[PDB]
Design an enzyme around this catalytic site. Structure first.
Site, PDB file in Angstrom:
ATOM      1  N   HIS A 176       0.848  -1.190   0.000  1.00 31.74           N
ATOM      2  CA  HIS A 176       0.000   0.000   0.000  1.00 31.74           C
ATOM      3  C   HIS A 176       0.883   1.239   0.000  1.00 31.74           C
ATOM      4  CE1 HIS A 176      -2.883   3.007   0.593  1.00 31.74           C
ATOM      5  NE2 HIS A 176      -3.747   2.366   1.358  1.00 31.74           N
ATOM      6  N   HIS A 179      -2.624   6.955  -1.180  1.00 31.99           N
ATOM      7  CA  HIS A 179      -3.534   7.726  -0.317  1.00 31.99           C
ATOM      8  C   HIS A 179      -2.853   8.482   0.828  1.00 31.99           C
ATOM      9  CE1 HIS A 179      -5.691   4.326  -2.211  1.00 31.99           C
ATOM     10  NE2 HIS A 179      -6.589   5.254  -2.492  1.00 31.99           N
ATOM     11  N   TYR A 181      -0.340   7.761   2.808  1.00 31.45           N
ATOM     12  CA  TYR A 181       0.134   7.056   3.985  1.00 31.45           C
ATOM     13  C   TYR A 181       1.668   7.035   3.959  1.00 31.45           C
ATOM     14  CZ  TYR A 181      -4.745   6.277   4.793  1.00 31.45           C
ATOM     15  OH  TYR A 181      -6.089   6.470   5.005  1.00 31.45           O
TER      16      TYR A 181
HETATM   17  C1  LIG Z   1     -14.644   2.583   3.137  1.00 32.31           C
HETATM   18  C2  LIG Z   1     -13.439   2.615   2.249  1.00 32.31           C
HETATM   19  C3  LIG Z   1     -12.241   2.082   2.701  1.00 32.31           C
HETATM   20  C4  LIG Z   1     -11.117   2.110   1.883  1.00 32.31           C
HETATM   21  N1  LIG Z   1      -9.934   1.580   2.350  1.00 32.31           N
HETATM   22  C5  LIG Z   1      -8.809   1.588   1.556  1.00 32.31           C
HETATM   23  C6  LIG Z   1      -7.624   1.046   2.035  1.00 32.31           C
HETATM   24  O1  LIG Z   1      -7.588   0.557   3.163  1.00 32.31           O
HETATM   25  N2  LIG Z   1      -6.497   1.059   1.241  1.00 32.31           N
HETATM   26  C7  LIG Z   1      -6.545   1.608  -0.023  1.00 32.31           C
HETATM   27  O2  LIG Z   1      -5.533   1.614  -0.726  1.00 32.31           O
HETATM   28  N3  LIG Z   1      -7.726   2.147  -0.501  1.00 32.31           N
HETATM   29  C8  LIG Z   1      -8.864   2.135   0.280  1.00 32.31           C
HETATM   30  N4  LIG Z   1     -10.042   2.689  -0.188  1.00 32.31           N
HETATM   31  C9  LIG Z   1     -10.069   3.261  -1.576  1.00 32.31           C
HETATM   32  C10 LIG Z   1     -10.576   2.167  -2.509  1.00 32.31           C
HETATM   33  O3  LIG Z   1      -9.635   1.115  -2.564  1.00 32.31           O
HETATM   34  C11 LIG Z   1     -10.900   2.675  -3.914  1.00 32.31           C
HETATM   35  O4  LIG Z   1      -9.791   3.355  -4.454  1.00 32.31           O
HETATM   36  C12 LIG Z   1     -12.109   3.605  -3.913  1.00 32.31           C
HETATM   37  O5  LIG Z   1     -13.163   3.044  -3.164  1.00 32.31           O
HETATM   38  C13 LIG Z   1     -12.576   3.880  -5.337  1.00 32.31           C
HETATM   39  O6  LIG Z   1     -13.465   2.831  -5.649  1.00 32.31           O
HETATM   40  P1  LIG Z   1     -14.450   2.872  -6.919  1.00 32.31           P
HETATM   41  O7  LIG Z   1     -13.640   2.600  -8.170  1.00 32.31           O
HETATM   42  O8  LIG Z   1     -15.523   1.817  -6.758  1.00 32.31           O
HETATM   43  O9  LIG Z   1     -15.099   4.234  -7.009  1.00 32.31           O
HETATM   44  C14 LIG Z   1     -11.179   2.664   0.608  1.00 32.31           C
HETATM   45  C15 LIG Z   1     -12.387   3.199   0.163  1.00 32.31           C
HETATM   46  C16 LIG Z   1     -13.516   3.174   0.978  1.00 32.31           C
HETATM   47  C17 LIG Z   1     -14.810   3.751   0.485  1.00 32.31           C
END
Ligand SMILES: Cc1cc2nc3c(=O)[nH]c(=O)nc-3n(C[C@H](O)[C@H](O)[C@H](O)COP(=O)(O)O)c2cc1C
Length: 358
Positions: A176, A179, A181
């Site tokens: 990861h 975002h 981090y």
């Molecule tokens: C509730 C939630 C938790 C997420 N947790 C992570 C995460 O832990 N690590 C990560 O890289 N992205 C995380 N994401 C981002 C998603 O992996 C993804 O990029 C985002 O939901 C876009 O999805 P979509 O293509 O369906 O719109 C999270 C998104 C949501 C809504």
């Protein structure tokens, strides 16, 4: 249907291109995987489908969210194995995402009340908050700019965690690096203000992710290692002057790691902040599997794979409200809406495994 044309990802023969994006759900009570996680993934596991787990801690300092799972202790490994087995039972491929939040933490999530570690001392701005254990929003504290030797220790945590992930039965791991981090705190020049070997020039900023990717490749093999990045995102003040340049620098180092290792990585995963060109430029530069994520729909995913823009497409938001998103996409059925209010709650069923199927 392009999304259902088989794809070979390393030694994994996937039956379709619908991937489960990693999504934190805060159901791993006390950082220990729970039976709820088993059902959640089982309900949405599919034969020949690739799934990526929620971010998982690599150390007792890799957390910035409540009740997120870990892979650094023998207890966690024991519970993950039970989950991995249920996912494999349904014929799905699952990678465990190793997640360290870096500066995106709080004292309540830092054993001994110590400040979260990062590349710089600059804290995330007030316009971003963190979820506290009681549901309130907290302020990000001032982080500590780790010394060169601790970087090696953080890298060691990734290596040990990757080994632990294999002991649990996972088919591989995903780094990861997005975002805002820890890894992204080193990549973005809007954060990395270091004046040593890990700061300044792009090559220096990309050193951290390079050592991390190299460490996990040397532990479990490049074919079982995926890398997720986000060249242009504003999450937690993780910005860069030239997002494209940064993305291409990481991609260039991944291609070189593959040549020196003599094996390709499992895939490259780029999330979009939804120009189109940013995504296509990295895909054409990366020598291997390319997974796209961010704001994709059934129609948008088909177009990306048909035009050769990506090999696999991961879905986040739509896989929360739609347990059978794969089947729904195959039949072009209606997709269910998601209730954000239960995204990070601790209920093992409500808003987690209670979503209706077709
Ligand atoms: C509730 C939630 C938790 C997420 N947790 C992570 C995460 O832990 N690590 C990560 O890289 N992205 C995380 N994401 C981002 C998603 O992996 C993804 O990029 C985002 O939901 C876009 O999805 P979509 O293509 O369906 O719109 C999270 C998104 C949501 C809504």
């Amino acid at each position: 249907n392009p999304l259902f044309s088989p794809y070979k990802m390393g030694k994994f023969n996937l039956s379709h291109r619908v991937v489960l994006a990693p999504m934190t759900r805060c159901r791993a009570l006390n950082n220990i995987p729970q039976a709820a996680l088993g059902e959640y993934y089982e309900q949405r596991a599919t034969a020949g489908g690739f799934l990526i787990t929620e971010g998982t801690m690599i150390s007792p300092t890799s957390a910035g969210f409540p009740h997120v799972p870990g892979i650094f202790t023998k207890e966690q490994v024991r519970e993950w194995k039970k989950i991995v087995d249920v996912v494999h039972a349904k014929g799905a491929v699952i990678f465990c995402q190793l997640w360290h939040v870096g500066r995106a933490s709080h004292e309540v999530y830092q054993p001994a009340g110590a400040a979260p570690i990062s590349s710089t001392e600059k804290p995330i701005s007030n316009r971003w908050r963190i979820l506290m254990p009681d549901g309130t929003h907290g302020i990000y504290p001032k982080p500590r700019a780790i010394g060169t030797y601790e970087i090696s220790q953080v890298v060691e945590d990734y290596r040990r965690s990757a080994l632990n992930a294999i002991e649990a039965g996972f088919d591989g791991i995903e780094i990861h690096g997005a975002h805002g981090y820890l890894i992204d705190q080193f990549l973005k020049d809007g954060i990395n203000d270091r004046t040593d070997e890990y700061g300044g020039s792009l090559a220096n900023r990309c050193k951290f992710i390079t050592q991390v990717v190299q460490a996990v490749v040397s532990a479990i093999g490049a074919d079982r290692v995926g890398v997720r990045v986000s060249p242009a995102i504003d999450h937690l003040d993780a910005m860069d002057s030239n997002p494209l340049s940064l993305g291409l620098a990481v991609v260039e180092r991944l291609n070189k790691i593959q040549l020196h290792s003599g094996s390709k990585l499992a895939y490259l995963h780029v999330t979009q902040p939804d120009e189109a060109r940013l995504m296509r430029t990295l895909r054409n530069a990366y020598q291997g599997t390319f997974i796209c994520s961010g704001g994709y729909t059934r129609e948008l995913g088909i177009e990306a794979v048909a035009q050769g823009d990506a090999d696999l497409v991961s879905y986040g938001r739509l896989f929360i409200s739609n347990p059978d998103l794969v089947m729904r996409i195959k039949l072009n059925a209606p997709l269910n809406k998601y209730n954000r209010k239960t995204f990070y709650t601790q209920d093992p069923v409500v808003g987690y495994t209670d979503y209706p199927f077709l």
